[PDB]
Amino acid sequence: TTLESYNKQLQKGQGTLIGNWWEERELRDVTGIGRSAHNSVNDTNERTMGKKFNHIPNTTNSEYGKGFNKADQLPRT
Amino acid sequence: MREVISIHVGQGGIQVGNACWELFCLEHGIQPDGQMPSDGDDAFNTFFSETGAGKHVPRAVFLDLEPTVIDEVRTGTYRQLFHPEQLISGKEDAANNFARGHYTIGKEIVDLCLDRIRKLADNCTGLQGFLVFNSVGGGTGSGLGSLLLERLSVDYGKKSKLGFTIYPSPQVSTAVVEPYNSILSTHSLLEHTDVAVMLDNEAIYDICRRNLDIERPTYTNLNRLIAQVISSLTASLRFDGALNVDITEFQTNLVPYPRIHFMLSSYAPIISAEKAYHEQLSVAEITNSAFEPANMMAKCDPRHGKYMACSMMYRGDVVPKDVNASIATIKTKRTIQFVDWCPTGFKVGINYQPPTVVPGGDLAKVMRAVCMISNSTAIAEVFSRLDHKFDLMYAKRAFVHWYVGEGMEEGEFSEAREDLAALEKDYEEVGIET
Amino acid sequence: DIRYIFIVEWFDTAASLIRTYYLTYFTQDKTIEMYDLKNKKVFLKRCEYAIKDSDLYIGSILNVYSRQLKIVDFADVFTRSKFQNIKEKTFAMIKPDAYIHIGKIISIIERSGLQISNLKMTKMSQEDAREFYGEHKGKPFYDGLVNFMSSDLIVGMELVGDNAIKRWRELLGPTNTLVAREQAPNSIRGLFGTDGTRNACHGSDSPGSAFRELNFFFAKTSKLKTQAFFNQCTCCVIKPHIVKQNQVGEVIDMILSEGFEISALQTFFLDRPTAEEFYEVYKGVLPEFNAIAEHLTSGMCYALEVRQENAVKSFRDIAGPHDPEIAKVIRPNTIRARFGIDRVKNGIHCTDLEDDGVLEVEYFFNALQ
Amino acid sequence: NPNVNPVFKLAREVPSPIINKLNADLKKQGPFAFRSLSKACQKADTFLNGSLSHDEFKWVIKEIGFSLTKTEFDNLFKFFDKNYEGKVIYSVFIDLVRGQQSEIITQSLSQGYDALASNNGGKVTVESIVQRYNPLAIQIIYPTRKIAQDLQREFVAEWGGNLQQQVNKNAFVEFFSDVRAFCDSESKFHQYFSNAFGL
Amino acid sequence: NRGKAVNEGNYIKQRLAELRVRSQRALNERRQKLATLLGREHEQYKQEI
Amino acid sequence: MREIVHIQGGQCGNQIGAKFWEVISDEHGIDPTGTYHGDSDLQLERINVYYNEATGGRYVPRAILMDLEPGTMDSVRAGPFGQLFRPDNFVFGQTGAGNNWAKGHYTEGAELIDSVLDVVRKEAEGCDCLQGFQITHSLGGGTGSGMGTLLISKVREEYPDRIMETFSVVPSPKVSDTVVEPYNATLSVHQLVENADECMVIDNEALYDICFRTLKLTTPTYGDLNHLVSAAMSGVTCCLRFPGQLNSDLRKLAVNLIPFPRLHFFMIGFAPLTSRGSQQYRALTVPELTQQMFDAKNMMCAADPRHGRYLTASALFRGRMSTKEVDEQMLNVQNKNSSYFVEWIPNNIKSSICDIPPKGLKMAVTFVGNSTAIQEMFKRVAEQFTAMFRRKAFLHWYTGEGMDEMEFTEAESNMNDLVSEYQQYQDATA
Ligand SMILES: Nc1nc2c(ncn2[C@@H]2O[C@H](COP(=O)(O)OP(=O)(O)OP(=O)(O)O)[C@@H](O)[C@H]2O)c(=O)[nH]1
Ligand SMILES: Nc1nc2c(ncn2[C@@H]2O[C@H](COP(=O)(O)OP(=O)(O)O)[C@@H](O)[C@H]2O)c(=O)[nH]1
Ligand SMILES: [Mg+2]
The missing domain is CATH 3.30.1330.20 (Tubulin/FtsZ, C-terminal domain)
Structure with a gap:
């Protein structure tokens, strides 16, 4: 365990390119607080979960009644 | 002046009934609201009762011990049709324990259910019989449904009862204690129901895939096939035809013996929206597709047993002879053998109303089809597997402590295996040749 | 390069359901490739069918490989922008000074590049005329314009295309006709305008107004019935292949110059099953019925009502042979000869039976109204 | 009970996170991105009545570069379409999304328009705005490496092709107001006003 | 009592066809003249050409 | 319908429950003000399970926050989401536990347990139809481990049929947070087997391993770890709140997850x-x-x-x-x-x-x-407990408040018997 170490508080930039640099890079792009915001409160939801694709799908039980076949509405003769 | 009463219980029962009533309502021109504009034969008395002006109501009885699924019927796409008080709902779930659903919580809904059923029967005038869908590999259906069947029998007697049960499969199932739930339900049903149909889950998947080229189906798709089978079974009673079939003509035609009355069904042809119009779908080939081993809806190999009685109901514009030609073809085919004491073992009805397809369905429009609901001694295997599982898992009192606490006796389990063994022995003996 | 995309759905007859296809459009070398969104199978790939450039747009139709498609909506970012420019709107209108010059004004319009998307037949009733030109009440031009609108027949058109709100104006020429001749001799006003009150034609001055004027004419709730009388007249139909070839105007004046008093020109969209009910007179009769009907449902078609002292046969004379091929050799000065192409796509078609003249004209103008 | 409020809801509320997050993303596109949304609004509305249809909104929205999920669109349409009349005014859409306009900023915006018209005698034209400005004044709001020679290219491209197009005073406030949303401080935006217009 | 609909309803079908016969036969004849018109019409142009 | 009650204790329990309530409120659409900004109609049909309603319309959690020292309860309120809790449900002591059972379960807790029991009973009687109680508590902690087990025992004794859930953050073999970790650890499980229905152990050491091996956050904080357990709990009760093809309740698992009475x-x-x-x-x-x-x-x-x-x-x-x-x-x-x-x-x-x-x-x-x-978790804890009990270490504190060495004797016997009976099946064959 020799993480941290050769990289102090710096905003933006390619960093120090030592150890595990890539993983934390995106976060600072995602929002503030590169790691363990000093004691700019860090929202715990931001780190653990990941990208958000926000939508609530239909019940999928209410999928029976809804169904249409346009080819049944032609005037015919 | 003929009608039927439908009994729906359990989660799977409710979902299957949803599709069945969808097909029924679409087949008669009654929109979801309950109004039927048409634009008039009394073809709608079989399942629906006129409300006085326009709107109708289905003779449905719904029961479940949990509010989750009952509510959705009251908040979905059919909220203005069903009777406001005929959707009986519980307060707590059974939790997949047979004891819970048969002696303490299941005894405080029987009174209400009997009241509703009595009102339905009184309003009905020519009640032909009962149609029951229930699941056994679960909590609510096995116990509540069995007790309801017991009470219905003790109340009415000679009225016939038909059961489209939902049993477990060989390898694909949800419950880890499902076997125990099955045996008690079977012990209850064997001596009080008349005709039952095995409709396991696994078999439906295979047909769905291998025909409709849908490798990722869902329960909803499986529901539609069962709904279609039910509709084809019950159509003859209400639609005009030349060779009609009355549900009364299954007890006296498709149950050789009072005890051995278990039979497995199938449905076809099932062709998608692409492979539909480039084939022949003629009467001759469709019959041969009905008897193929893999097509049947129950995971029961037919080739491993004799046939004892089979009934077929054609629909559409079939001509009678082609029914005869197919019958002769299957009879002559050596691959299929018939029991030594059933010389004439087919009973065919021909109807006229063509098959109808629900919107957006996987089934493309067709003009002929056969709904084989035959019975065969091959069903022995399914009871063998459940009995073997029961023995293996009851050898050393696993999960037992749950049951004894709810009221069930320890010695009850002894009876169930006894009856199952007796039934297995009866099946083995009956098929022997003279 | 750049690729154009579209969404297509086809209404089969054998298969009840209706699919959705792609019809990829390579603009580099005039090629058509069709793919289906569902089931992920290449449907039709990289083969030219020689579809003209202007045909592709929402609301139209085009027939390819015995299957007739109908682009319904756009698919991707780039496709919309390129053609989205062609959606502007404007209402055209021709006053009853040029009634004898109806055929010509139709012709020159197609040259400019605009399109005649629809056209009907009305004589402006006095009662509902007043609601029109509402903004002109105050000026003395009101009363003068009142009666003239109600005098005789009028023709209304809708133009769909680029800058139609102004491109119509510039060609249509200044308002006053007299001044047009000095400055714009080659303009609509210059060639067919007598005085200010008898200015030949008009255009919508403002878009927001441009929405107003049409809602009066082609809206479903319209107070302009198809004025016509159903006695002593014979009907002819400009078949679809003409409205694509841009001679609709040319055919119109030719009949007018023969002494026939035209009463209406209207557009109808009718599908395959409806079409068959018109040619039933030829259902199994001589003309090899099956082939013709399928074409009439390959695009719009104008319907013409014609009159004369003797209706049925006289008009037939100038229309004095079903196949144009025989027409060219022995009747060079007949309508069919000039525009006919083949056995089944022969230009005009006028009734060829004495006693059924009334009904056929009635059907286009009474039952389908 | 006055000490206890009943909260509840008597009027619909702007959904918020669907609308705000559009503000954050739309920030990153660039100074003229805000103008991009407005222009795409007019271009779709080539009919001059005041709005866009149901689906076209999807078309109009999915051109700027936001591929929102259905609900993301689901919430927005309910708040904007009060009674499902079938149309929602797009003009209101822009006023709510970009942000808020201060009276001083609008007053400053109008003053520049009057000054620009004063040199031309009350007449307006894109040539005057194209001919006189500071392309480096855009540097203050956000720095850049692009050459000043090309900057003039962006200003004409974001404008109309013709140099004689009519310009209205109401348009002048709208045009700058589109730019302002990109800047995060009122002081920075107005200093560009002077620097760009030399006032 | 319900038989009234069948008695009256059954009447509807049989008459409908009968009315059809007049519609067709009246429709058939005019089919006869048309073939004559074009035929003789075509025959001339064979000589004329 | 079939609503549940949540009880938490100690600092660890307080943090875990606070974060769980945060996530649940976020998902169900409940904001810091306690007002409704939901979008789908599906977000209120079963809201009553985790929230009640009163005049005014600010939905309230039916939770319990409690401990023997005032600081922790003071900290939770000050942060966001601290205004959702009923101000009445704060029951707190005035002495502190100090990592000694007797100071938590016999004297101080007994003096304080009455109020918590009363509040729990009032909430239960208020709720329409109980489904069961889920508790988040730490065995390694002083106050929670002891008096929390007393709370569970009392509640189970009062209600015979309602099912009890238990989340336990048991100590880890390597990273230790107390010099006397096993005492309050082993004895707690000793007392829990006879009463608690469902126990699901959660290990701190696993969180660090899981975090730095998959999540890949350079400097994690307790807030992050709490969120994973919070999501686990939230998912534990999914069907009971939302509809689906095949709903499942807590009881279903018990009949499906507990082959024997003592293996839970x-x-x-x-x-x-x-x-x-x-x-x-x-x-x-x-x-x-x-x-x-x-x-x-x-x-x-x-x-x-x-x-x-x-x-x-x-x-x-x-x-x-x-x-x-x-x-x-x-x-x-x-x-x-x-x-x-x-x-x-x-x-x-x-x-x-x-x-x-x-x-x-x-x-x-x-x-x-x-x-x-x-089995390794219990064997390691029991092994360490026996190793440090061989020398009568630290016993004078425990023996000083009504604890006799033989009671400790019963707990270790129970632990060893549980380990042996639980391991039997690995070699047992049909
Ligand atoms: N094929 C099929 N089977 C279903 C469906 N719904 C439920 N089942 C069956 O139901 C079994 C599980 O039982 P539950 O879902 O709990 O329903 P139940 O048997 O009434 O038991 P309860 O929980 O008390 O409702 C599964 O093994 C399925 O076989 C369905 O829609 N299609
Ligand atoms: N993951 C995690 N563990 C915690 C947290 N707070 C406390 N703990 C654990 O809980 C134990 C301390 O328990 P404590 O709250 O003091 O209980 P008490 O001694 O009875 O008051 C320590 O071993 C920690 O591992 C937290 O925020 N996150
Ligand atoms: Mg249930």
């Missing part, structure tokens, strides 16, 4: 957990979810499941999936691993589905496992 120790897990970098580069399929959930490292328990067997386990899927995919993957996992599941039980894998997934994610699952691997 479960281990949990969560997925799909992915770092902030690879979120968009990995598919989301029933197959890809399957391998991760059984992934040996992904399980939250200190002991790797690959050292024992599996008797019964359930997976509660959430979101729109296709059942066909669900069952087939279960058969694959149960078959291709011919020796990881006891041979005398057929179909020992559970399935479940719900039709509403957590906000901001496509599909995820919660795995509950009755795994014999836990």
Whole structure:
């Protein structure tokens, strides 16, 4: 365990390119607080979960009644 | 002046009934609201009762011990049709324990259910019989449904009862204690129901895939096939035809013996929206597709047993002879053998109303089809597997402590295996040749 | 390069359901490739069918490989922008000074590049005329314009295309006709305008107004019935292949110059099953019925009502042979000869039976109204 | 009970996170991105009545570069379409999304328009705005490496092709107001006003 | 009592066809003249050409 | 209908429950003001399960916050979401536990337990129809471990049929947070087996391993760890709040997860957990979810499941999936691993589905496992306890408040008997 170490508080930039640099890079792009915001409160939801694709799908039980076949509405003769 | 009463219980029962009533309502021109504009034969008395002006109501009885699924019927796409008080709902779930659903919580809904059923029967005038869908590999259906069947029998007697049960499969199932739930339900049903149909889950998947080229189906798709089978079974009673079939003509035609009355069904042809119009779908080939081993809806190999009685109901514009030609073809085919004491073992009805397809369905429009609901001694295997599982898992009192606490006796389990063994022995003996 | 995309759905007859296809459009070398969104199978790939450039747009139709498609909506970012420019709107209108010059004004319009998307037949009733030109009440031009609108027949058109709100104006020429001749001799006003009150034609001055004027004419709730009388007249139909070839105007004046008093020109969209009910007179009769009907449902078609002292046969004379091929050799000065192409796509078609003249004209103008 | 409020809801509320997050993303596109949304609004509305249809909104929205999920669109349409009349005014859409306009900023915006018209005698034209400005004044709001020679290219491209197009005073406030949303401080935006217009 | 609909309803079908016969036969004849018109019409142009 | 009650204690319990309430309020649409800003109509039909309503319309949590020292309760209120709790449900002492059982369970707690019991009973009687109680408490902590077990015992004694859930953050073999960790640890489990219904151990050490091996955050904080357990709890109760194809309740698992009365120790897990970098580069399929959930490292328990067997386990899927995919993957996992599941039980894998997934994610699952691997957890704790009891270490404190050495004697005997009886089945064969 020799993480941290050769990289102090710096905003933006390619960093120090030592150890595990890539993983934390995106976060600072995602929002503030590169790691363990000093004691700019860090929202715990931001780190653990990941990208958000926000939508609530239909019940999928209410999928029976809804169904249409346009080819049944032609005037015919 | 003929009608039927439908009994729906359990989660799977409710979902299957949803599709069945969808097909029924679409087949008669009654929109979801309950109004039927048409634009008039009394073809709608079989399942629906006129409300006085326009709107109708289905003779449905719904029961479940949990509010989750009952509510959705009251908040979905059919909220203005069903009777406001005929959707009986519980307060707590059974939790997949047979004891819970048969002696303490299941005894405080029987009174209400009997009241509703009595009102339905009184309003009905020519009640032909009962149609029951229930699941056994679960909590609510096995116990509540069995007790309801017991009470219905003790109340009415000679009225016939038909059961489209939902049993477990060989390898694909949800419950880890499902076997125990099955045996008690079977012990209850064997001596009080008349005709039952095995409709396991696994078999439906295979047909769905291998025909409709849908490798990722869902329960909803499986529901539609069962709904279609039910509709084809019950159509003859209400639609005009030349060779009609009355549900009364299954007890006296498709149950050789009072005890051995278990039979497995199938449905076809099932062709998608692409492979539909480039084939022949003629009467001759469709019959041969009905008897193929893999097509049947129950995971029961037919080739491993004799046939004892089979009934077929054609629909559409079939001509009678082609029914005869197919019958002769299957009879002559050596691959299929018939029991030594059933010389004439087919009973065919021909109807006229063509098959109808629900919107957006996987089934493309067709003009002929056969709904084989035959019975065969091959069903022995399914009871063998459940009995073997029961023995293996009851050898050393696993999960037992749950049951004894709810009221069930320890010695009850002894009876169930006894009856199952007796039934297995009866099946083995009956098929022997003279 | 750049690729154009579209969404297509086809209404089969054998298969009840209706699919959705792609019809990829390579603009580099005039090629058509069709793919289906569902089931992920290449449907039709990289083969030219020689579809003209202007045909592709929402609301139209085009027939390819015995299957007739109908682009319904756009698919991707780039496709919309390129053609989205062609959606502007404007209402055209021709006053009853040029009634004898109806055929010509139709012709020159197609040259400019605009399109005649629809056209009907009305004589402006006095009662509902007043609601029109509402903004002109105050000026003395009101009363003068009142009666003239109600005098005789009028023709209304809708133009769909680029800058139609102004491109119509510039060609249509200044308002006053007299001044047009000095400055714009080659303009609509210059060639067919007598005085200010008898200015030949008009255009919508403002878009927001441009929405107003049409809602009066082609809206479903319209107070302009198809004025016509159903006695002593014979009907002819400009078949679809003409409205694509841009001679609709040319055919119109030719009949007018023969002494026939035209009463209406209207557009109808009718599908395959409806079409068959018109040619039933030829259902199994001589003309090899099956082939013709399928074409009439390959695009719009104008319907013409014609009159004369003797209706049925006289008009037939100038229309004095079903196949144009025989027409060219022995009747060079007949309508069919000039525009006919083949056995089944022969230009005009006028009734060829004495006693059924009334009904056929009635059907286009009474039952389908 | 006055000490206890009943909260509840008597009027619909702007959904918020669907609308705000559009503000954050739309920030990153660039100074003229805000103008991009407005222009795409007019271009779709080539009919001059005041709005866009149901689906076209999807078309109009999915051109700027936001591929929102259905609900993301689901919430927005309910708040904007009060009674499902079938149309929602797009003009209101822009006023709510970009942000808020201060009276001083609008007053400053109008003053520049009057000054620009004063040199031309009350007449307006894109040539005057194209001919006189500071392309480096855009540097203050956000720095850049692009050459000043090309900057003039962006200003004409974001404008109309013709140099004689009519310009209205109401348009002048709208045009700058589109730019302002990109800047995060009122002081920075107005200093560009002077620097760009030399006032 | 319900038989009234069948008695009256059954009447509807049989008459409908009968009315059809007049519609067709009246429709058939005019089919006869048309073939004559074009035929003789075509025959001339064979000589004329 | 069938609403549940949540009870938390100690600092660890307070933090875990606060974060759980945060996540639940976020998902159900409850904001810091306690007002409704929901979008889908589906967000209120079963709201009463975790929230009540009163005049004014600010939904309130039916939770309990309590401890023997005032600081922790003071800290929770000050932060955001601290205004949702009923100001009355704060029951606190005035002395502190100090990591000694007797100071928590016999004298001080007995003096204080009356108020907590009264509040719990009032809330229960108020609620329409109880379903069961879930408790978050730490065995290694002083105050919670003792008086929390007293609370559980009293509640179970008062209510015979309602089921009890227990989440325990047991000590870890390497990273220790107390010089007397096993005392309050072993005895707590000794007393818990006879009363608590469902216990699901959660290990701190696993969180650090799981975090730095998958999530990949350079400097994690307690706030982050709390969130994973919070999501696990939230998923534990999915069907009871939202509709689906095949709903499942807490009782269902008990009949499906507890073959024997005394074997009710479960281990949990969560997925799909992915770092902030690879979120968009990995598919989301029933197959890809399957391998991760059984992934040996992904399980939250200190002991790797690959050292024992599996008797019964359930997976509660959430979101729109296709059942066909669900069952087939279960058969694959149960078959291709011919020796990881006891041979005398057929179909020992559970399935479940719900039709509403957590906000901001496509599909995820919660795995509950009755795994014999836990034997190392108890054996290590019991081994250390016996090693440090061989020398009568620290006993004078415990013996000083009504604790006799023989009572400790009973606890270790119970522990060893549980370990032996639980391990028997690994060698037992049909
Ligand atoms: N094929 C099919 N089977 C279903 C469906 N719904 C439920 N089942 C069956 O139901 C079994 C599980 O039982 P539950 O879902 O709990 O329903 P139940 O048997 O009434 O038990 P309860 O929980 O008390 O409702 C599964 O093994 C399925 O076989 C369905 O829609 N299609
Ligand atoms: N993961 C995690 N563990 C915690 C947290 N707070 C406390 N703990 C654990 O809980 C134990 C301390 O328990 P404590 O709250 O003091 O209980 P008490 O001694 O009875 O008051 C320590 O061993 C920690 O491992 C937290 O915020 N996150
Ligand atoms: Mg239920």
